[PDB]
Design a protein around this ligand. Sequence first.
Ligand SMILES: [Zn+2]
Ligand SMILES: [Zn+2]
Ligand SMILES: [Zn+2]
Ligand SMILES: [Zn+2]
Lengths: 286, 286
Amino acid sequence: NKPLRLIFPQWQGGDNPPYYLGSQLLAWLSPDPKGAVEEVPVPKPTGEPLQEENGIVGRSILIDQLSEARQLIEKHTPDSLVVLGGDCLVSLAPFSWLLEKYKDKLGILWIDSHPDVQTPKEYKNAHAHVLGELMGNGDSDFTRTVKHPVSPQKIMIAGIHDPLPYEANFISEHKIQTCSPEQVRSGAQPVLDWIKNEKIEYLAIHIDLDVLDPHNFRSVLFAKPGRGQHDFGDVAEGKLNIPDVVKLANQAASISKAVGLTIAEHLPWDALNLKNMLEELPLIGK
Amino acid sequence: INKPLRLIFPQWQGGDNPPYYLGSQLLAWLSPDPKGAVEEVPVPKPTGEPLQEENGIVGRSILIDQLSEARQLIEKHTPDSLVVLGGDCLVSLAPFSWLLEKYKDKLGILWIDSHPDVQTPKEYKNAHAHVLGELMGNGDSDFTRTVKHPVSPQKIMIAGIHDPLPYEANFISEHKIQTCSPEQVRSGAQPVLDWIKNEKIEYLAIHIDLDVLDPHNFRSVLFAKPGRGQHDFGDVAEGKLNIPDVVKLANQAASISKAVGLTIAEHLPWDALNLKNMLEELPLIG
Ligand SMILES: [Zn+2]
Ligand SMILES: [Zn+2]
Ligand SMILES: [Zn+2]
Ligand SMILES: [Zn+2]
């Protein structure tokens, strides 16, 4: 067995500098690694704004980091991947690798308030594109790297609620299964039935931390200090708590072999503000 | 030459709250690189075994041992300045006592806190509420006996304090301790600047209790504990300042006096702790 942990502090897919610290802090908080560790080279945020590049903010650097993530994976030819992001787009190369290795026996359990199936026609921040790209849909600079696109029947989106009209149509068109926060709480029966009926032997788990209720976990986008009610376009916000997500992941991993785990979209507002405070205070560091 | 010392002091027993330990380690990781020497006070990690009240003080004996060891580490370096990454507020006892021995009545103590920390075991069993009084030579003899040069009360300024308890209002009045309210801080901190000028404060020790911060905007303090109710903390005063107010205040004061001490205390990073435990419990990484 050969696991690889990828520290992937990508922040450009969500155009939000604090993802970088969020990935480094996630890495610091994590248990000791079981196998190999690599960090994907990501330029630190400098305050210079990213620009839209043919409909995608930061297109060029995202393609570079996607290429470098794949190179680091190939270097270790791992059978399992833990990805410490970073915005949701960090899962593209890791889950593409797992699709090449495990093919139609892989299922993708996408734990997110949102389905991440938009394209640059709908949204300029690429962290909303990644699950669609794993199906081979969307912007070809990204889908060209996906050699074994996942069937929509081998996806389960858990924690999703109140989807946008585009997203509900996409989910409906492609027959993609979902599992609401309510059904996660009541035992995640759709996830168990899906693993059995779609013969999911290997499992890639993506945890977008914004599946979590921001009232109880305050290091996600929707817990940004000083926010107003409509600051995020009234898109869906998290309704699960950490024990719900842990239980769901362990339920699914008990009836299939977990080979992927991504933790994405950590936005540690307190740690960021504390880091900046210490930099600005007298004496310390000076 | 000037000899600085950074003291990492993950004491959690003074506030009887295990997450202070992680709070100190995280603060050390978030801080800029140290300029001089670094020591870490050995503190036993919380084991879940509850601390006991010992003659009116929770965890009395281990707090005395940690005080003695912190003093030893300071005297090993005989530093001219000290940065203390706590830890509950009691971590400032040995560092500020040393600074008082060195700088004597030329030192002012700027205590940035929602609370004055002048209680004794008669009022409160958690020793983090005792430390400023002990620096004045008041209170429990196991702690005051270590303070060779007690600070005179006119060389104290408590900034960010509001709505004190009756015992504390009487203590402050009887000893003529100067204060500065959150509102006065936001309007320019005129009481603090006046105090530096009028008392001719030449050297400055700054204690920052992070619970001076409004828990609505900084969520890593006691009063931002997820799921709290309104009266869980006895309706004691809660923080009203924001991080930019504290940074400005500290830099105002250090612009007209020589900063020789800085303590950052009472960090309780609820999100980091909850994420750390989540990762330990998840498949593949846990
Ligand atoms: Zn996502
Ligand atoms: Zn999301
Ligand atoms: Zn305090
Ligand atoms: Zn306090």
